[PDB]
């Protein structure tokens, strides 16, 4: 019976879906994330846009628009680590993105 | 600020609220049987034959 130890630290561990397939080949791909300005509202902790540029195409991922997935509002996402030396599953906070490639206007 | 990629996660723990234990009782509670009709007490011949 394997067991662990829950330890919640708190930072966001960004998790990525792609609208075209699995990744399966990491290479020469940029990753930047574009949060909102005003921190007086809670939009600083909610609004975020992820950019994942490759030399061929570039991918945009939102949290607010028509196309944002409903698995981060109706459900909470965590990321475990499981440091097996000390024997602790120390657990962070996560958020799931679903990127569409950007083409035109 | 590069945000490189990582390996494949092995397992996915699903946290969910537990099953509703001690909600149903171990015996069942039926609606009791409607009783069979009784002959009422105090029944006597009230009709006497005339004359």
From Swiss-Prot, chain A:
It comes from the Eukaryota. In normal conditions, deacetylated by SIRT7, promoting the association of RNA polymerase I with the rDNA promoter region and coding region. In response to stress, SIRT7 is released from nucleoli leading to hyperacetylation of POLR1E/PAF53 and decreased association of RNA polymerase I with the rDNA promoter region. The modification Phosphoserine is found at residue 25. It is found in: Nucleus, Nucleolus. Belongs to the eukaryotic RPA49/POLR1E RNA polymerase subunit family. Component of RNA polymerase I (Pol I), a DNA-dependent RNA polymerase which synthesizes ribosomal RNA precursors using the four ribonucleoside triphosphates as substrates. Appears to be involved in the formation of the initiation complex at the promoter by mediating the interaction between Pol I and UBTF/UBF. Component of the RNA polymerase I (Pol I) complex consisting of 13 subunits: a ten-subunit catalytic core composed of POLR1A/RPA1, POLR1B/RPA2, POLR1C/RPAC1, POLR1D/RPAC2, POLR1H/RPA12, POLR2E/RPABC1, POLR2F/RPABC2, POLR2H/RPABC3, POLR2K/RPABC4 and POLR2L/RPABC5; a mobile stalk subunit POLR1F/RPA43 protruding from the core and additional subunits homologous to general transcription factors POLR1E/RPA49 and POLR1G/RPA34. Forms a heterodimer with POLR1G/RPA34. Interacts with POLR1G. Also binds UBTF/UBF. Interacts with PWP1. This is DNA-directed RNA polymerase I subunit RPA49. It comes from Homo sapiens (Human). The gene is POLR1E.
UniProtKB/Swiss-Prot annotation, chain B:
The modification Phosphoserine is found at residues 26, 34. It comes from the Eukaryota. It is found in: Nucleus, Nucleolus; Chromosome. Residues 29-41 have a biased composition (Pro residues). Residues 18-41 are annotated as: Disordered. Component of RNA polymerase I (Pol I), a DNA-dependent RNA polymerase which synthesizes ribosomal RNA precursors using the four ribonucleoside triphosphates as substrates. Involved in UBTF-activated transcription, presumably at a step following PIC formation. It is in an antisense orientation to and overlaps the gene of the DNA repair enzyme ERCC1. This gene overlap is conserved in mouse, suggesting an important biological function. Component of the RNA polymerase I (Pol I) complex consisting of 13 subunits: a ten-subunit catalytic core composed of POLR1A/RPA1, POLR1B/RPA2, POLR1C/RPAC1, POLR1D/RPAC2, POLR1H/RPA12, POLR2E/RPABC1, POLR2F/RPABC2, POLR2H/RPABC3, POLR2K/RPABC4 and POLR2L/RPABC5; a mobile stalk subunit POLR1F/RPA43 protruding from the core and additional subunits homologous to general transcription factors POLR1E/RPA49 and POLR1G/RPA34. Forms a heterodimer with POLR1E/RPA49. Part of Pol I pre-initiation complex (PIC), in which Pol I core assembles with RRN3 and promoter-bound UTBF and SL1/TIF-IB complex. Belongs to the eukaryotic RPA34 RNA polymerase subunit family. This is DNA-directed RNA polymerase I subunit RPA34. It comes from Homo sapiens (Human).
